[PDB]
Amino acid sequence: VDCSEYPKPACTXEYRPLCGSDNKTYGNKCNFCNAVVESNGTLTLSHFGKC
Amino acid sequence: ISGGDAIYSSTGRCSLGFNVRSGSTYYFLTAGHCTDGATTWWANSARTTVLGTTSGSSFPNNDYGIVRYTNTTIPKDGTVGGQDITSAANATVGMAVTRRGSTTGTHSGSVTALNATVNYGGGDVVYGMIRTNVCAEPGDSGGPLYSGTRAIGLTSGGSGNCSSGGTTFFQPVTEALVAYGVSVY
């Protein structure tokens, strides 16, 4: 997952979970990538699927 | 199964929009971004209860898709949860609406604008969208937007969340009904 094209003003949604380094399950890639941006690049991907 | 219930494709989970029909043929509407590249649809994560197969998909530009029921025994309620739906209508600014989704359940709000353009990126732009102040979260895609017994739209996307509040865009359902020659019941 690359969050280069972020942030995005909106996301579709569908549920395809990712697990962030904050132990939070992100609903989809767009949600995850917007959060990485919001964290100013500190949040990272832990693994695919729910935490 | 009814509007707002979970639906699974090979890729992920979305929500059923509305149960519709044409003659004696039953289908269900959902988001186009969910039907895009999906063939078979199941009622459970285990994929043991088949619903049907994708018959049409329109995304981006629009955001709607339709799935033909192949499962002959599953109840196909013309409702959203327990809310009966008897007709479809056009959204208006200031209209009080309600959304139901498989992740967040039922949330209400109002229509704040019409004909909005939403850019999901990568050339995925949708037009003519209904803007509202209703929240929605991943898994809620394709769920119904209704007002009383009237079907209004299909959940397409948004920002924010149900805790802090957010903005959600919906695809007018009237356009989908006409495109497929189907009707709610």
CATH number where A46 lies: 3.30.60.30
The answer to whether A16 contacts chain B (CB < 8 Å) is yes
- Of B81, B70, B64, B73, the C-alpha closest to B6 is B81
Provide the resolution (angstroms): 1.7
| B129 Cβ contact partners less than 8 Å away, ≥ 6 residues apart | B63, B115, B116, B117, B118, B156, B169, B170, B171
Dihedral-angle region of residue B135 (phi above 0 means left; psi in -120 to 50 means alpha; beta otherwise): beta
Query: Rounded to whole angstroms, what are the CA distances from B92 to A9, A13, B30, B105, B161?
Result: 23, 23, 21, 23, 23
Best residue in B137, B162, B164, B170 for a mutation probing chain A (most A CBs within 10 Å) = B137
Query: Rounded to whole angstroms, what are the CA distances from B124 to B8, B62, B159?
Result: 22, 10, 16
Q: Is the domain defined by B1-77+173-185 classed in CATH 2.40.10.10?
A: yes
Q: Catalytic amino acids of B?
A: 33, 63, 141
B window 109-128, beta carbon within 8 A of A? 118-122, 124
Strands (E), B82-172: 83-84, 87-88, 96-101, 105-119, 125-132, 144-147, 150-161, 165-172
**Residues in chain A within 8 Å Cβ distance of B163:** none
Pick the CATH number of B78-172 from 2.40.10.10, 2.40.37.10, 3.40.50.300, 3.40.50.800: 2.40.10.10
CB contact under 8 A, A12 and B139: no
CB contact under 8 A, B120 and A10: yes
CB contact under 8 A, B120 and A11: yes
Position B80: which residue type? Answer: V
Q: Which experiment gave this structure?
A: X-ray
B164 close to B136: Cβ distance less than 8 angstroms: no
Q: Do domains B1-77+173-185 and B78-172 have the same CATH topology?
A: yes
B165 close to B158: Cβ distance less than 8 angstroms: no
Query: Rounded to whole angstroms, what are the CA distances from B118 to A40, B44, B129, B134, B174?
Result: 24, 31, 7, 16, 19
The answer to whether B158 contacts chain A (CB < 8 Å) is yes
Task: Name the domain count of chain A.
Answer: 1
Q: Mind telling me how many Å the CA of A46 is from chain B's nearest CA?
A: 19
How far, in Å, CA of A29 to CA of B84, rounded?
34
- The residue range of the domain holding A17 is 1-51
